[PDB]
């Protein structure tokens, strides 16, 4: 099987590995980024994988050590790909670059190409199927790119805030106009002073929307938007409800577009 660290990397892998080998995701969604504590069983799965796919040590830091013992021809480390260097954007995260790389359609393409290359070397008997899969992935990516772009085009100029500084890759690519982000605990609303400052910025900068993520308590989001003119939305950067499969990455980009539009559309 191909073992991907995070769900959206699984979406990409599952397009390329379709009908060749299974794709598995290592991490449950609710422990995604940087905190997770790998179990011995997870390390076993990594070592047994046909191919491991992950962003790299500045994202899934918890798996860096486990991957040292996996041969280079059995891993794709997305942030280290030669073609990914000109695609990186400046941004707990704490590094210099935005490492939410799966939100860039161009980095997704580079990732698919890297996965395809490694699998063809590992499984030459399946080259034709792997080639067909890459062709289908790229065709869908092109079609989705066009659909999403047109759906988000009328929403340009409409300001909003987010609670997670992740979306830059997707926003820049499709021409959305974010006003910025607030650091907000998903379980506990900010204190009196900081809540005042946030609510003031929401009104002053003329935000249409503020976007939370699925793990945020509705009450925390309501406390942020209370008093302001601002509509509340939800973005899901992991596509948690989308099942792995051939069309999943395209479904993910399309869903994220729907989530932006659901809130930003109208007035
Ligand atoms: Zn993050």
Q: How far is the CA of 236 from the centre of ligand 1 (A)?
A: 11
Token couple for 72: 């280079």
Q: Helices (H), strands (E): how many in the chain? A: 9, 8
Rg of the chain on CA atoms, in Å: 19
Give CA–CA dist 49/39, Å, rounded: 16
3-state helix, strand, coil in the chain (%, to 5): 50, 10, 35
Q: How far is CA 76 from CA 12, 25, 71, 96, 171, in A?
A: 12, 14, 10, 21, 25
- What is residue 211's DSSP assignment? E
What is the structure's resolution, reported in angstroms to one decimal? 1.7
Q: Are 53 and 69 in contact (CB under 8 A)?
A: no
Q: Are 183 and 213 in contact (CB under 8 A)?
A: no
Secondary structure of residue 3 in the 3-state scheme: strand
Query: 34: Cβ–Cβ under 8 A, 6 or more apart, which residues?
Result: 59, 60, 61, 62, 92, 93
Ion ligand 1, residues whose Cβ is below 5 A away: 33, 166
Q: How far is the CA of 126 from the centre of ligand 1 (A)?
A: 36
- The separation between CA 244 and the C-alpha centre of its own chain, rounded to angstroms, equals 14
Q: How was this structure determined?
A: X-ray
Token couple for 9: 């990397």
Ordered by where they begin, the domains of the chain are 1-153 (3.40.50.1980), 154-267 (3.40.50.1980)
Q: How far is the CA of 157 from the centre of ligand 1 (A)?
A: 25
Q: How far is the CA of 76 from the centre of ligand 1 (A)?
A: 20
Report which of 52, 57, 61, 50 is spatially closest to residue 26, judged by C-alpha positions: 52
Report H helices in the chain. Answer: 7-16, 40-48, 64-67, 105-122, 127-152, 168-174, 192-204, 218-225, 248-264
């Amino acid at each position: 099987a191909v073992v991907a660290s995070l769900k959206p990397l699984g979406f990409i892998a599952s397009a390329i590995a379709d009908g060749v080998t299974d794709t598995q995701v290592l991490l449950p969604d609710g422990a995604s980024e940087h905190d997770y504590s790998l179990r011995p069983s997870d390390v076993k799965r990594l070592q047994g994988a046909d191919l491991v796919v992950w962003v790299g040590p500045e994202m899934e830091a918890f798996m860096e050590k486990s991957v040292r013992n996996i041969p280079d021809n059995k891993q794709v480390t997305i942030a280290q790909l030669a073609d990914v260097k000109p695609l990186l954007m400046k941004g707990h995260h704490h590094g210099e670059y935005n490492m939410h790389l799966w939100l860039s359609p161009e980095i997704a393409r580079a990732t698919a190409v890297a996965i395809h290359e490694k699998l063809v070397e590992l499984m030459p008997q399946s080259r034709a199927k792997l080639d067909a899969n890459l062709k289908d992935f790229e065709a869908q990516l092109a079609a989705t790119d066009k659909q999403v772009g047109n759906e988000l085009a009328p929403l340009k100029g409409k300001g909003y805030f987010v609670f997670h500084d992740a979306y830059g890759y997707y926003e820049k690519h499709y021409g959305l106009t974010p006003l910025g982000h607030f650091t907000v605990n998903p379980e506990i609303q900010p204190g009196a002073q900081r809540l005042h400052e946030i609510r003031t910025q929401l009104v002053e900068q003329k935000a249409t929307c503020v976007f939370a993520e699925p793990q945020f308590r509705p009450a925390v989001v309501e406390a942020v938007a209370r008093g302001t003119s601002v509509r509340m939305g939800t973005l899901d950067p992991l596509g948690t409800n989308i099942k792995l499969g051939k069309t999943s990455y395209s479904a993910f980009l399309s869903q994220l577009a729907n989530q932006y539009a659901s809130c930003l559309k109208g007035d």
